[PDB]
Amino acid sequence: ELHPPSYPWSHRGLLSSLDHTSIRRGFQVYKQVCSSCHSMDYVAYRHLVGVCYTEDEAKALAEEVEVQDGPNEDGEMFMRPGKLSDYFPKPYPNPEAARAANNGALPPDLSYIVRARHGGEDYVFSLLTGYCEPPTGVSLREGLYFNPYFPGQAIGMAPPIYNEVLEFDDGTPATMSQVAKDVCTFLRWAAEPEHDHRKRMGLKMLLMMGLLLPLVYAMKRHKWSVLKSRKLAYRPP
Amino acid sequence: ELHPPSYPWSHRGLLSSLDHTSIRRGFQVYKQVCSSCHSMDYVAYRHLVGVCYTEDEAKALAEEVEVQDGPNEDGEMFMRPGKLSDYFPKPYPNPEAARAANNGALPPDLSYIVRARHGGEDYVFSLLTGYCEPPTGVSLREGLYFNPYFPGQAIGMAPPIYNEVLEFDDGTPATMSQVAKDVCTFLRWAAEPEHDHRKRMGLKMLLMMGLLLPLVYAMKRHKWSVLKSRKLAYRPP
Amino acid sequence: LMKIVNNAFIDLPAPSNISSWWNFGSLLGICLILQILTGLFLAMHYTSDTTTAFSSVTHICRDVNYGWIIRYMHANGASMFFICLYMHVGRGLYYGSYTFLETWNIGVILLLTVMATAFMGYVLPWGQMSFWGATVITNLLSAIPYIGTNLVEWIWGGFSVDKATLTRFFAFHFILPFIIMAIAMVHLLFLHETGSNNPTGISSDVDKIPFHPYYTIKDILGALLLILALMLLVLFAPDLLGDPDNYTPANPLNTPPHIKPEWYFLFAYAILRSIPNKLGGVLALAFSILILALIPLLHTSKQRSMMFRPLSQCLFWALVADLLTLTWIGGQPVEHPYITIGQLASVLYFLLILVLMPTAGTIENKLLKW
Amino acid sequence: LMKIVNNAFIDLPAPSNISSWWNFGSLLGICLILQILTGLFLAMHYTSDTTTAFSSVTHICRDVNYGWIIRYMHANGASMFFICLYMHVGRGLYYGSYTFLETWNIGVILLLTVMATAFMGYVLPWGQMSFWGATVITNLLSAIPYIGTNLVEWIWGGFSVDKATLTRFFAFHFILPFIIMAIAMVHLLFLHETGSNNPTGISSDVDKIPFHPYYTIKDILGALLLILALMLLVLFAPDLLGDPDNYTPANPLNTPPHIKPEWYFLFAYAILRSIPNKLGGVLALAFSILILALIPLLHTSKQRSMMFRPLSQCLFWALVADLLTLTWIGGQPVEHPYITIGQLASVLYFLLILVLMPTAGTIENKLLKW
Amino acid sequence: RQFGHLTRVRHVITYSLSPFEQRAFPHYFSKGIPNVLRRTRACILRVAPPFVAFYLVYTWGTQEFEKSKRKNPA
Amino acid sequence: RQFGHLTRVRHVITYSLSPFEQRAFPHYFSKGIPNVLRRTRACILRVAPPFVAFYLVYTWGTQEFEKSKRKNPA
Amino acid sequence: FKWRGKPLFVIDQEAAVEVSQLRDPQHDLERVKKPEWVILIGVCTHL
């Protein structure tokens, strides 16, 4: 194994939230890069509302991609422009096609991959940025590559990311690093659409329970005070 | 409405079973006639074992028809000869195609249609054999036909059955009637694969409960006999 | 030493003039346990998804080893269940159980617990009467102003019945018998301070007797008749009560020409169907049930029973005509020869209860001067 | 008048030297009701089908209004549940509850009811540890000769885990808390004839006091700490105990490199994993649990407690090292530095219980001459 | 509640016999059948006539309904 | 069971006061803290040393495991 | 069509209907915006 470090974040703090601006560029990445071979099936464009995009804007992406829906009255099926209810475009219809599109290897889903891998983000960010030349005395089949963070240090992961592989909207740098930041910020949101709200109840709880707990502890000590101050004696003849 | 009569059967009696020989020819009908537009999805060839056909013989029909199964390692799907686990060949992939193949009308399934229609068999047998010329003062669109037993007396039922429409194995007459007998015998088995066994427990029950019920009724009258014979009196001064 | 509480079922005082009717008082303990036992093994292969539930029933009736019986021991068992109740409850009127006010109210909360339970039990298989059987009844709660649309949409999990409607019942339906299982003990608890109530209505304290030999086997004899009358139907006529349509798959885009829920609502459903107004009959519905809580303020006679009130028998068995009528009239459609009935039969129901049974004791007291 | 039975929770005699430990004795009533309450609302959107169950969880955590919390109030609630027990039970050893033989056995049947329940609760979402978490444990019952293959295939609904395995648990798992809910009352019944049992172990009949003001609020204070320690985890570290892998979809054609069930088995799972033999450790497993039924024949001291048996404290807190060790050693893989431990730690567990705690009272009696 | 503190009894005698010393079903046909009829003659008049009308209202309910769907001369 | 028929008591006096007539937390810091330490000094020696070894066995359990995956000179 | 889990039912002589003679006095174009595109929740008002 290899243990990733504890890289800080804009959300590591126990009352820290996600930089939604970072998410906004993060979603660009999945569509331009990862959506060719990663099947995020547990998400739709509508969940991006109130998070990174708006109704009409995100809907513009549903108009962009075609989706297989609707039994025609002829008895056949067709393609339409998607909508906000529609989940993401699945790259490939089944897993086996993905194994066929690769060197026998499968891409996992990326919906809950963060919470389904030790370290979560810090694994992933260091995974992409852990590519290096193989060491001496190592050999690998074609298609496989080297990355220390992956178990076995042997993976059919083509390098997906590199500096100036694409460009973003507002125009921030398309480095291998900043891109790697927004994307891991993006995936944590995948398996946590509640982060913005978890901390909110994360905070409401304390200033109640921190406030009640003395009072109940007093009402306890209030009633018990009869016995916390009770004396006795023994007066037979 | 129209109420069908109570036609007798080889199984109407409360300890009567099904003529499995009649079933054996009945299954020929569904494959030659009804399987073009009726989607029996709740049945497989294996259920015919111990009923009308054997393992190897019925399996010969699974070898006959192709079935869509199996994601290829390429990532695609294909066709194979079916097997005993495989349910019947669905005629059409979806309902809408059936509406398209007809004059806008849908064929219902025939798995549980008997128990899902008042009268069951007697409806069906008289349905096919209720075709006649329309009466005076009636008009019908093309594709529709007349049959009094159907509600509204108006139906898109093309006449499926007629004398000498096919031939059977052992060589019994292929009349419009005998065929109509085996087929309704066949469908009752669809929504009752247990008839042969229901009567068996149908019979075991009586010669127990008919035998116990007096005995318990005696053990009752046994214990209560103290009070069924109890006398009193009243002797104060 | 939890052996002393189980004397109430072994060494309990109870009368001796007891009919065969009170077999029914304990068959529910056998129906309920059996029904639970059946349904529990039954739900080993049920599925709470629209796309497979109806099929998941077919997984049973075809492919399971002798499981096909379990669909019917349970289902038609629920009919034999209700056959006990309206022989268990009309009893209390024909004998005067209802003076035990602390108990009689409990006897209601079961009924609304069940009749709202069973409503969730017919719907699981998506029979094309499941759907509409859930639509019509539940739609009525829109009759209320300013909240009816909310609670109904709130329970539908949306704006109309769907997968989300299903699972929400299956848990609400798999559970209440256990809530009944404990309330059963409560229903026997308030009894235990006073015991049973003879047909004569007389306080029979002098002639209370044991329970292990006598009424145990007597109930078992009744359970035999129950199992008989249950084994008969499942083996010989399982399609009798369970309507044929429910074997149809669900489809909102088509209705049957004739709608009716299961037979047992029909005395009550007809009362609503009588009223052309929407809300004006709904409150009559629950009132028709909750009148039972309202009867014991109408025990006019200073007697109890009706074996010694012949006029009460003239009315009481007349009430059965109305119920058994509304049973049949409910299950039949809306046409002129039948509307004329329910406009009377509904009124007769409320009329016999709240006018003439009270009127009897006010007279019968005067016929014998007290 | 069912107001007299609820005096046991209002006007009950009970001691006054009572610690904060016995908060835990009633938190289960709060854990259980809460957990049931959570899970019940939770199963409003669960589905018992392989093709949709894992997704049906995602139906909750994403699309339901504040339902995502309910996955964790329930799930990690089940961890806080067990944290009570092994603080509830080791208590009875450190204080001497176990002399109440009629009660202590009840305290076992709960545990096997739960630890076989919870085993059916981790498996529903098809986490890729659900499957193998069900495979490994259930596979062991093949260890028996001539029937092991039968019962296992019999429970698998086939020859291996499948859809049919799932639904059969979901009903077995949605139900037992209610069976526990009544057994809870039984567990309090045999108590009620004798009442509680102070830390000193002395029969404190002279100093038994009311219950509504004092221990009610005291328990509520503990419930607050429970809800706190529960609200903390769900809000701040819900991924802590619930392993990461369980968010993976199920696939029999691939395993993780490291297997471990949920943390709480691990003291027990390690005992089996120690034994290279298959069957030779299985009987030790249930024996490690069912030893609790066997302890009360090993109350050598004619004292009761251990506040007044200092040597017992030297052993008792040493036992905790073994459990908390086997907890950690269980959750770690099979290699030489760890096998050497469990071959001792397993023996230490049986050793401390059946040799040295008895040996104490045989000595401590002699240290003070009786 | 149980036996012992219910009420008072004075000057009452109870005779009774084992079950074994008597047939279970004596005089079942011989004496029961009149008692059945006597039980019948006391109840039929206050039970039947509702069901009598029910049979008629069940009859006329169909016939009028039967005629209404049959056409009129027009 | 309830109050009234438990046992016998003779020649015992009980004094006690309302809660309202006394502060809830008097001498909490002043007197409690020594009593905490006194409670501590009576229990630590029979509680800690197990956990002391646990910390060590938790230590050596990793180090030896840490070395074993590291290679040998060959 | 199917919609909200409910159906979706979708001029020369339609305007010929006399509104006052009807039960609910309701001109057609009060019910629609376009004449030749009809919409309604397809649910029988009675039951």
Ligand code: HEC
């Ligand atoms: C060439 C198509 C493709 C591209 C483009 C792609 N992925 Fe991958 N991904 C794969 C395949 C194939 C695997 C299989 C890795 C394995 O089998 O271990 C994989 C594996 C992964 C994993 C699994 C990690 C693990 O432990 O196995 C993650 C996380 C991941 N990719 C994230 C990304 C990210 C982030 C990007 C964009 C920077 C990306 N993917 C772009 C195809 C792709």
Ligand code: HEC
């Ligand atoms: C030519 C295609 C075709 C053939 C062959 C065919 N059916 Fe039909 N069937 C249909 C269609 C189309 C309907 C639709 C009826 C309607 O829409 O009212 C239908 C309706 C039915 C129904 C519905 C009855 C009801 O009460 O709803 C039954 C039962 C049935 N067919 C059975 C049969 C039987 C028996 C045969 C052979 C004697 C048969 N089908 C052969 C096409 C066919």
Ligand code: HEM
């Ligand atoms: C008073 C209690 C109950 C009533 C009134 C009731 C009602 C019903 C009825 C009438 C059916 C018939 C469905 C059919 O025949 O197709 C049914 C089906 C079903 N019952 Fe219940 N039920 C009750 C309790 C239970 C219990 C206790 C369980 C489980 C332990 C259960 C689980 C099921 C399931 C899974 C089905 C689907 C089977 C089917 O639809 O055929 N029910 N219920």
Ligand code: HEM
């Ligand atoms: C699961 C449901 C029920 C169970 C388990 C149950 C159980 C019992 C039992 C065992 C008895 C004693 C037998 C007898 O008195 O003949 C009884 C009596 C009684 N029941 Fe039920 N019952 C149920 C439902 C109901 C209902 C729906 C009512 C509606 C009014 C009701 C009202 C009564 C009353 C008033 C009595 C008193 C008997 C008397 O007065 O002699 N019970 N119940």
Ligand code: HEM
């Ligand atoms: C002592 C009682 C119980 C134990 C030990 C237990 C165990 C568990 C655990 C640990 C989970 C976590 C699954 C996860 O986090 O993903 C779970 C899930 C679940 N529980 Fe149970 N449970 C219990 C009672 C219940 C009850 C009472 C209900 C319903 C009333 C229920 C229904 C469910 C359902 C539907 C799930 C699936 C949700 C999920 O997997 O996240 N459980 N169970």
Ligand code: HEM
């Ligand atoms: C849902 C599960 C349980 C519930 C609801 C429950 C309930 C209770 C309650 C309320 C008490 C009194 C509080 C106290 O004594 O501090 C108690 C005491 C006790 N419990 Fe539990 N308990 C449960 C599980 C267990 C288990 C698993 C054991 C295992 C041995 C157990 C053994 C005992 C014993 C021996 C006592 C006697 C207390 C004494 O001796 O003073 N209980 N239980």
